[PDB]
Design a protein around this ligand. Structure first.
Ligand SMILES: CCCCCCCCCCCCC/C=C\[C@H](O)[C@H](N)CO
Ligand SMILES: CCCCCCCCCCCCC/C=C\[C@H](O)[C@H](N)CO
Ligand SMILES: [Cl-]
Ligand SMILES: [Cl-]
Ligand code: NA
Ligand code: NA
Ligand code: NA
Ligand code: NA
Ligand code: NA
Ligand code: NA
Ligand code: NA
Ligand code: NA
Ligand code: NA
Ligand code: NA
Ligand code: NA
Ligand code: NA
Lengths: 57, 242, 244, 296, 242, 57, 50, 99, 49, 48
């Protein structure tokens, strides 16, 4: 078939690329899945709180 | 061979062209990817993280750089005095340049969406006060007094257990996207102006400091988007890097 | 079909010598879709207080008149409650119902071309020779309610032929036939909302293509009055009142 | 529970009531047989131009016609057929000695309003939305093809414009750049619709900023930033003066075209880029003239 | 690699070639398209809109340009006098140059279809009269008198409540399409001649003007078509545009 | 699949184009649907009238 | 580098090397170098006759 | 103080309308941002001089020599990726030579 | 791009080669063909006269 | 220009000789007592 040696092998993200060689790291960058995780950096709090609530109770 | 006919663009090297290229190492397999914390998937994830907004971008002294990170508030005379002022424009020279949002904007020609600025009062527990943060949409000249500023989008902030308050600068534009605003013609894309006024006054007992500071943190909302990549206005290099 | 009545707000217009009604580009004014909009704040739709007939100044048609024009969002920015909203709000949006009226007698003659020209940009004569890059003054690009007179109607003061001005929503006032023109214009712009102060969506042109004429003895004063009403007006981005 | 004028109210209707519909018309309309008609009450020939509508009179009602099955295509008059033809819109000079870009680089302000042919066509419409295909033809002033390497860079508004041939901005870490030799066939590239507006405006009747509009600033009237797409920069890929004088002609072909609101076609000679100024002392008629109205 | 063999035409840049080109901005998404009134789909939509035909293309004076837009009619001597004359050729130098149809024609080498000219009488309500508008197919020299003009396609126009009348210039050609007619050999594609005559006379009472004007508006019919794009005969520029 | 970023995206008109890149604005101009709306500019009257009728009644 | 341009009857014929007509905003043109293989192009039946 | 960004939304601060936002977030993905060729190295092979005058050169692979490209990548601490290297060669005047 | 390898005959202009060439006029449609008497399909039709 | 800001009607002379101006009931109170100069001018209807 083809070698699975691209830098994104085994990633929880899907790619649509084009290639003409046996090594997949030669493939185009392609399009990708648009998932996002804002909370990871913007709201990494242990005990999440609502916006309607007073943060410090 | 198979009849072909090369068209214009042949042999050109387009920096952003996404094509295929011959691999230098056949059958090479990269080191497995371990799990690493803090993986980023989209830059918009960073535009939503608040970073300190240098509203007090006045001191340029060598020893006074750390004080651009916060602005003063203190006991006044009770006539709705003006505290601070600044343009709401994200990708424009000014206070927003100190924020991550402002920096990432520099890499995109256009943006769209609501912005937010959170003000944290760092006075003492005994200090009280109410401020009026107002946002003046385009066309409105810098409000001369509080009675004029309050006619636009605003929020009356009351100091208390909850140290901070958030002023949301709603996306109020004529166009779907805004290119970076500069002086002159591109001032067409200005977002407006923000101004802090004393709603009442900074009150304090005997024994507590007469001057306290406020720290502004800014970021984007969930509806914020950017498009058309370009290079930042500044290149941090003068001579060759050795 | 020759008679008509236009009622909107607390104002009514009557006519017994009309020539049907034109609906610019076959579209009625409408409000902004939820998918065509961007501004997130809830707009104001004052309705009856701003969507009514406003009668601007009157002009006198002379045997030698060249023609006049009015920029539209503009003509109303200092009148009634429409003007107040246009000044207090950053964003504005609306269509218009324009009714130009001019009557004479069965012994007078002449023909006026009443047309709507979107994005009517004014040019200058460039110092006559064409070597001077001069520009039209604020008083001419946005004349207000008093309108402005054309200096070179043949080229519409913009280097374009008036003979082709009929590709725009228009109507004629031929004194032997009708005494008024009614044109309904939808909101036209590349944006869902825009400033009523900095931008003029279109211009109203009233130009005599066939000169006015009559024999001495018949009343010589033949006025041309402009009445217009906003439609589906929406405003957003509230702040203090701004004049310009 | 709720006031009636609010229930029956129509404020809020976002759908535009259209009085007309677009019908299929792949060919010119056919002609149907017609016979004589001697009757009162029906008058096809009589119209009323005052109404503002074009005559709806057809051939059949004016003369006795035969049947003609018209199979003439209407495809070549679509917007794409009309506009999808590359035309000159820019020209950049990179001479060896002179006062015009003599340092081996140039910054062309992207504006297709510098050439009459292309400009007059697009100015037939008020608004236009489209993707485009830019082709860059380079050579010396004599048309000679020389072995020289050039770099074209698109500098969106806000990005740093190169101040010299060795400017740091030529690193194009993010801006799109094209590296070609004059010996290679002309570089060609695809550009999307990059305006923050829903379409480009060949005409903007207004000002870009608020405030007092004094004599000195009338320069800004009719200037719409939604049409200002940035700069196009060129340079000799090197650190020394080039051995040859160069010229770069820029051609543009529109694709996927949408257009709105037609206007009268340019009548007078063009004088400047940002405006419709005309020579007031040389106002020529739209066309040809003759001696008498009763003689050809 | 895969055996290929480039053919003639390689590397050429054909202005009208419709091919693919590398995109400069990957993953770029354009501003949504709002709904805008007056969208055009085909130029033929414009060829059917009547625009003023400058039949009176005589005055060249600076102050008299506005009078080319209409021609006079007045009380005569009653001998079927000639009023005005003009070639029916759309893409030819003359009256049709002032029309949108004539202008769009300039962009196409060939056209086909019936044309129409609507005449609007702008005299007074008390003015009466009957005119004879005649269309003389190819070969017919300019009719010397009304008795000769009436032998071709024509229409007797009666002034009344309905101010205008439409003269339809039916498509009467030997060829399926006509290229633009010019003097000389290409006069082969001439459409013919139009001429207005007094059927009776312009009658008026005492107190009403003895001279009134007529405005001609011209456009194309539903069977009108154009083909083979080219550049207009004129280029509105002398020196570089600054 | 492919990016939907051409200037005619969401248009009530069908196109037959060719493309080799992931961005659809790079596609050929192609052929298009031949629909027309003359009345929009030639007969934008509110109350339409027949050709057999006298326009002004 | 040469420029070939098809000027249909009615279009403005260039009067000089720097003529404005060379803008080819609508006429079909071909730009080729003499070092490139001969330019080749397809033409339809463009007569108004059959 | 909590260390989390404000979760306040437009809707709770002012009376908002309904807006169906269809603006794409595709151009801010990591690939869109970084998949653009930029200068990272420059090698000189002069005829006479003190910098590689013997017709050969050894460039230590390091993309940290140019500010534009460097500043972008330094926005992140760790990065995993494949790359496409392009080598543009010519004389110091930009002249293309048969070498 | 896709790996190719041009063979001899590249760039040559063979007078009798029957290939494809870029069309100069997009969407152009020729004048309909009327019926005309005496149409010839093969030259051998003439060799028999 | 000031009068036209209130309730009005543009009348065009023609075959129909007359026109009707409707003075809509625009009051603060449900009923109006007769208006006179002074205090009872509180019940004024307006001006034509
Ligand atoms: C090496 C990459 C080069 C990329 C060049 C990209 C050029 C994109 C040009 C878009 C031009 C749009 C022009 C539209 C409107 C005119 O600028 C205005 N009407 C001028 O007033
Ligand atoms: C003719 C074949 C040429 C092949 C060239 C292959 C080059 C491969 C380069 C990989 C470069 C990775 C750079 C990554 C990190 C930087 O070196 C470090 N941050 C420097 O401190
Ligand atoms: Cl900004
Ligand atoms: Cl012709
Ligand atoms: Na909260
Ligand atoms: Na490659
Ligand atoms: Na709508
Ligand atoms: Na009729
Ligand atoms: Na017609
Ligand atoms: Na047909
Ligand atoms: Na520089
Ligand atoms: Na091989
Ligand atoms: Na010439
Ligand atoms: Na937030
Ligand atoms: Na959404
Ligand atoms: Na071979």
């Amino acid at each position: 078939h083809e070698n699975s040696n691209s830098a994104t092998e085994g990633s929880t993200i899907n790619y649509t690329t084009i290639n003409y060689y046996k090594d997949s790291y030669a493939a185009t960058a392609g399009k990708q899945s648009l998932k996002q995780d804002p909370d990871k950096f913007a709201n990494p709090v242990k005990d999440i709180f609502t916006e309607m609530a007073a943060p410090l109770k | 061979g198979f009849p072909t006919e090369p068209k214009p663009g042949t042999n050109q090297f387009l920096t952003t062209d996404d094509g295929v290229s011959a691999p230098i190492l056949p059958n090479f397999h990269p080191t497995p990817c371990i799990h690493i914390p803090g993986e980023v998937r989209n830059l918009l994830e960073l535009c939503q993280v608040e970073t300190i907004l240098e509203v007090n971008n006045v001191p340029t002294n060598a020893t006074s750089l750390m004080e651009r990170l916060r602005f003063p508030v203190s006991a006044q005379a009770g006539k709705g005095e003006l505290c601070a002022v600044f343009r709401a424009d994200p990708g424009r020279d000014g206070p927003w340049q100190s924020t991550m949002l402002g920096q990432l904007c520099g890499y995109y020609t256009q943006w769209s969406g609501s912005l937010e600025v959170t003000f944290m009062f760092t006075g003492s527990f005994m200090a009280t006060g109410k401020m009026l943060i107002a946002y003046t949409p385009p066309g409105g000249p810098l409000p001369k007094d509080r009675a004029t500023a309050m006619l636009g989008t605003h929020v009356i902030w009351d100091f208390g257990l909850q140290s901070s308050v958030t002023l949301v600068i709603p996306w109020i534009s004529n166009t779907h996207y805004r290119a970076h605003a500069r002086d002159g013609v591109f001032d067409y894309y200005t977002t407006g102006l923000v101004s802090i006024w004393y709603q009442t006054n900074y009150v304090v007992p005997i024994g507590a400091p007469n001057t306290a500071y406020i720290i502004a943190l800014a970021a984007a909302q969930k509806n914020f988007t950017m498009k058309l990549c370009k290079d930042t206005s500044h290149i941090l290099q003068t001579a060759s890097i050795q | 079909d020759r008679v008509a009545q236009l009622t909107i707000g607390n104002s009514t217009i009557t006519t017994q010598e009309a020539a049907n009604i034109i609906v610019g580009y076959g579209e009625w004014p409408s409000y902004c879709s939820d998918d065509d909009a961007t501004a997130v704040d809830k707009p104001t739709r004052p309705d009856v207080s701003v969507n009514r007939f406003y009668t601007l100044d009157t002009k006198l048609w002379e045997k030698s008149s060249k023609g006049w024009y009015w920029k539209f969002p503009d003509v109303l920015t200092e009148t009634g409650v429409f003007g107040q909203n246009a000044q207090f709000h950053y964003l504005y949006r609306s269509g218009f119902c324009i009714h130009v009226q001019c009557n004479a007698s069965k012994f007078h003659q002449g023909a006026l071309l009443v047309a709507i020209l979107p994005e009517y940009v004014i040019g200058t004569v460039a110092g006559g020779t064409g070597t001077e890059d001069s520009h039209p003054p604020y008083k001419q690009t946005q004349p207000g309610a008093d309108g402005f007179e054309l200096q070179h109607p043949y080229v519409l003061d913009a280097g374009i032929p008036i003979s082709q001005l009929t590709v725009c929503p228009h109507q004629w006032i031929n004194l032997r036939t009708n005494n008024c023109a009614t044109i309904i214009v939808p909101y036209m712009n590349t944006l869902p909302f825009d400033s009523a102060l900095n931008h003029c969506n279109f211009g109203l042109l009233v130009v005599p293509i066939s000169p006015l004429d009559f024999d001495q003895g018949a009343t010589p004063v033949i006025p041309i009055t402009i009445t217009l009403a906003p439609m589906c007006s929406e405003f957003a981005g509230l702040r203090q009142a701004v004049t310009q | 529970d709720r006031v009636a004028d609010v229930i029956e109210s129509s404020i809020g209707d976002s759908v535009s009531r259209a009085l007309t519909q677009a019908l299929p018309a792949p060919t010119g309309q056919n002609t149907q047989v017609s016979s004589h008609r001697l009757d009162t009450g029906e008058v096809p020939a009589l119209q009323a131009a005052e109404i503002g509508a074009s005559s709806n009179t057809s051939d059949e009602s004016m003369i006795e016609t035969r049947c003609v099955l018209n199979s003439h295509s209407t495809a070549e008059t679509t917007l794409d057929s009309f506009f999808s033809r590359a035309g000159l819109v820019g020209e950049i000079d990179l001479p060896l000695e002179g006062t015009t870009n003599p340092n081996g680089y140039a910054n062309w302000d992207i504006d297709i309003t510098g050439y009459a042919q292309m400009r007059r066509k697009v100015e037939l419409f008020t608004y236009m939305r489209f993707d485009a295909e830019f082709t860059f033809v380079a050579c010396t002033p004599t048309g000679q093809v020389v072995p020289q390497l050039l770099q074209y860079m698109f500098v969106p508004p806000g990005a740093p414009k190169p101040e010299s041939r060795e400017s740091l901005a030529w690193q194009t870490a993010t801006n799109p750049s094209v590296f070609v030799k004059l010996t290679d066939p002309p570089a060609q590239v695809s550009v999307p619709f990059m305006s923050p507006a829903s379409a480009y405006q060949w005409f903007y009747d207004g000002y870009p900023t608020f405030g007092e509009h004094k004599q000195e600033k009338d320069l800004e009237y009719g200037a719409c930033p939604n049409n200002m797409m940035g700069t196009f920069s060129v340079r000799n890929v090197g650190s020394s003066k080039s051995k040859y004088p160069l010229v770069v002609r820029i051609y543009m072909r529109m694709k996927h075209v949408r257009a709105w609101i037609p206007r009268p076609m340019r009548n007078q000679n063009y004088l400047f880029k940002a405006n419709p100024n005309y020579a007031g002392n040389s106002i020529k008629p739209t066309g040809t003239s003759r001696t008498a109205i009763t003689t050809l």
